[PDB]
Amino acid sequence: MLKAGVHFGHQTRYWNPKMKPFIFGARNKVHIINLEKTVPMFNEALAELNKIASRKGKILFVGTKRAASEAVKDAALSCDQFFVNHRWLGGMLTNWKTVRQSIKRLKDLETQSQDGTFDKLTKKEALMRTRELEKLENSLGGIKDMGGLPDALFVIDADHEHIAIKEANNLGIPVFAIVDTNSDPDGVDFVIPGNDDAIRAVTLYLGAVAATVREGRS
Amino acid sequence: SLSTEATAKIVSEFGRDANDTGSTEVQVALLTAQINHLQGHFAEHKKDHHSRRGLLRMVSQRRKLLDYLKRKDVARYTQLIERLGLRR
Amino acid sequence: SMQDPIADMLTRIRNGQAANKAAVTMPSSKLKVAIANVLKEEGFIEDFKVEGDTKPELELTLKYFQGKAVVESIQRVSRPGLRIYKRKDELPKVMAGLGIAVVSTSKGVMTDRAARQAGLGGEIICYVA
RNA sequence: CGUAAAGCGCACGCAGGCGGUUUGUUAAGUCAGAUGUGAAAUCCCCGGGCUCAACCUGGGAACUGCAUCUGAUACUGGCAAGCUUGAGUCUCGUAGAGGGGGGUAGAAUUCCAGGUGUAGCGGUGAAAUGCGUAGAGAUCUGGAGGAAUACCGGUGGCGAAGGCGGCCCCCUGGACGAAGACUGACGCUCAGGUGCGAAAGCGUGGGGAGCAAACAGGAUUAGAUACCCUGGUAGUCCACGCCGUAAACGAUGUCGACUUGGAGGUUGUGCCCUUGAGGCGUGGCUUCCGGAGCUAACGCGUUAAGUCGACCGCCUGGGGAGUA
């Protein structure tokens, strides 16, 4: 009924007809999502998502827009799980191979950074290398300790992060998306009709998801 | 097209009553009235090829209705074309 | 103008299956209710319902098995331009038996299985595949 | 069959093809069975004989047909009766460069007559031909004449298409909307046929300001039968007749049905505090972008090139040739 306190839907513009089953849709030119449809959808997503979270799986939160950061870092990192909060690189799932060696360079350069030879031989090249750790750290941030390609995917906007959904559909990974009325249920296996760009809504929303992830068999 | 008083007069002459304004004899008689009036208009002008296209629609439509009423009731056909002075 | 209301019905069902439509309304007639009863009987539609008094309206609740649609390809065979009347031996099977062909026989509107069993051919209306 | 070849330039319409919906009758088409016939050989099947095979041969099947009789009556047709959701009529309005005839108005160009005035004007990339001390050009006044109608003017409107642009009158065609009434399938397409059909052109008679094929001169150029310049006749304009075509093009035939959306434009209208630059709906036509789908791709995309139905037109390698 009301777990979803304050969002009630959005996006007057570029609404998508495939979101027609999920729309109540009245006020002031903007569309209202039927949250009486959202609550069973979102409880199902918590059901199967807790089901794979208890099988000791990896979840990969996806939070590129603002302010999904650092809310996806806070929610993924509140669990022992993984995240993408800056620009999601085109192909970090479907060629994870090449992204594996970029993650390897991030590990070798942080080990080289805070412990080994960082002041060695140059100041300028050392500054160059440290800002390579800023670039590789904010792009390959959460995923750097994954070591596999994950068992599920939880995206926070379906149209803004269509690339990641397209790849997780390409690879047979269950996509869990909070769609808005502009988005499209592409290959999102567990759609949730919600609000993608309200920080109250995504902190409530990721709060529930991060709450149900960190219950395994324990 | 035609005057309101003229159309009312022809509906009163050919219909079962007034308000019977879509019967086949009535439509035929209204088309006939307008065809003759525009004989007067197109004797002059003669290069009003647009208005004439409207006139040939009236002629063709009258013809269709006479064919209908001929193959429904022939007594109504003979009384009708007898009264309107058409068919030559 | 409308000159084949049966092909219009089958068009309504193809374009309703293609648009994930829940149900399909159209003007109704005896032949459309006969065909619709064959389609419900053979499992291609969920239900039909004829309403109205002076202007009847047939309504077909369509079927969808998975996300996919049940009526895979419905075709009109005996169109008005060229009518097709088969005997009980010439009477075709569609998708090698996995898909009925609605034939109007003198005993009524039947399928190909039912009319080949009844021992009488007729006018083959539509392939439902 | 948008762009590869292929949608008549557009319509009206006869013969033709097709035809909403309900009931009754018929049973012509359709279906089922029966009978007569469909020569024999040949093909096919199961056997038999030549040592086998080819070959020969026994029996069947087949000969997909036609005729007659017996039935069935769902669909199509015939006949009779209806019914309104197709088509049409009436009432009231709306918008419009729809058409034809007549009149008028204002700017401007040219010409003519006159005043002022004086050495150039015009033209070009530059020039020259041309006009000009017989007074041009500039400027003011008066007049004549012809054609076109700035601004509004807008992927705006109307028309079947060609096309239609000052304002006013007369005659006239269509469309659309609102509520109600009436007819009751009267419908759709259309070979031959008939009509309309830009521009150029042709005939007869007018008109002739501007513009301008031809033509002439000046340049440019290697040449320049061109582009540029200066003139300039047919023609363009009117009346009547002919022609009968265009990249006559959305290179997309007509009519009807169904199939996610968004932003506009234009023209109706209903409802609701109008309490804005109101809100909410419902039609008609139209523009741009896009979804599924289709497509060789490009793109089309509820105005389809999607999903179907009816009828028409046309295509079949390039050239020769749309020619003889």
From Swiss-Prot, chain A:
Q: Which GO terms describe its molecular function?
A: structural constituent of ribosome; zinc ion binding
Q: What are the record keywords, sorted?
A: Ribonucleoprotein, Ribosomal protein
Q: Which GO terms describe its cellular component?
A: cytoplasm; cytosolic small ribosomal subunit
Residues with the modification N6-succinyllysine, per the entry, are K107
Q: Name one GO biological process term.
A: cytoplasmic translation
PROSITE patterns from the xrefs? RIBOSOMAL_S2_1, RIBOSOMAL_S2_2
Query: Which Pfam families does the record associate with it?
Result: Ribosomal_S2
Q: What role does it play?
A: Required for ribosomal protein bS1 (rpsA) to bind to the 30S subunit.
Say which family it is in.
Answer: Belongs to the universal ribosomal protein uS2 family.
Task: Report the HAMAP family cross-referenced here.
Answer: Ribosomal_uS2_B
Q: How does it assemble?
A: Part of the 30S ribosomal subunit, contacts bS1. Some nascent polypeptide chains are able to cross-link to this protein in situ. In collided ribosomes contacts ribosome rescue factor SmrB.
From the Swiss-Prot or TrEMBL record, give the protein name: Small ribosomal subunit protein uS2
Q: Which organism is it from?
A: Escherichia coli (strain K12)
From Swiss-Prot, chain B:
Transmembrane regions listed in the UniProt entry: none
Q: GO BP, one example?
A: regulation of translation
| GO annotations of cellular component type | cytoplasm; cytosol; cytosolic small ribosomal subunit
Q: What Gene3D superfamilies does the record point to?
A: 6.10.250.3130, S15/NS1, RNA-binding
Q: Does the keyword rRNA-binding apply?
A: yes
A single Pfam family it belongs to is Ribosomal_S15
Q: Does the keyword rRNA processing apply?
A: no
Give the InterPro entries listed for this entry.
Ribosomal_uS15 (IPR000589), Ribosomal_uS15_bac-type (IPR005290), uS15_NS1_RNA-bd_sf (IPR009068)
Q: What induces it?
A: Part of the metY operon that extends to pnp, also has its own promoter.
Q: Which GO terms describe its molecular function?
A: rRNA binding; small ribosomal subunit rRNA binding; structural constituent of ribosome
The intrachain disulfides are none
Give the keywords, sorted. Ribonucleoprotein, Ribosomal protein, RNA-binding, rRNA-binding, Translation regulation
Cross-referenced NCBIfam families = S15_bact
Role of this protein: One of the primary rRNA binding proteins, it binds directly to 16S rRNA where it helps nucleate assembly of the platform of the 30S subunit by binding and bridging several RNA helices of the 16S rRNA. Binds to its own mRNA, stabilizing it 5-UTR and preventing its translation. In the E.coli 70S ribosome it has been modeled to contact the 23S rRNA of the 50S subunit forming part of bridge B4. In the two 3.5 A resolved ribosome structures there are minor differences between side-chain conformations.
Q: How does it assemble?
A: Part of the 30S ribosomal subunit. Forms a bridge to the 50S subunit in the 70S ribosome, contacting the 23S rRNA.
Which protein family is it in?
A: Belongs to the universal ribosomal protein uS15 family.
The protein's name is Small ribosomal subunit protein uS15
Give the organism the record lists.
Escherichia coli (strain K12)
From Swiss-Prot, chain C:
In Swiss-Prot or TrEMBL terms, this protein is called: Small ribosomal subunit protein uS8
The cross-references to PANTHER family, in alphabetical order and at most eight, read: 40S RIBOSOMAL PROTEIN S15A
What does the annotation say about its assembly with partners? Part of the 30S ribosomal subunit. Contacts proteins S5 and S12.
Record GO biological process: cytoplasmic translation; regulation of mRNA stability; regulation of translation; ribosomal small subunit assembly
Molecular functions per Gene Ontology: rRNA binding; structural constituent of ribosome
Record key words, sorted: Repressor, Ribonucleoprotein, Ribosomal protein, RNA-binding, rRNA-binding, Translation regulation
What this chain does, per the entry, is described as: One of the primary rRNA binding proteins, it binds directly to 16S rRNA central domain where it helps coordinate assembly of the platform of the 30S subunit. Protein S8 is a translational repressor protein, it controls the translation of the spc operon by binding to its mRNA.
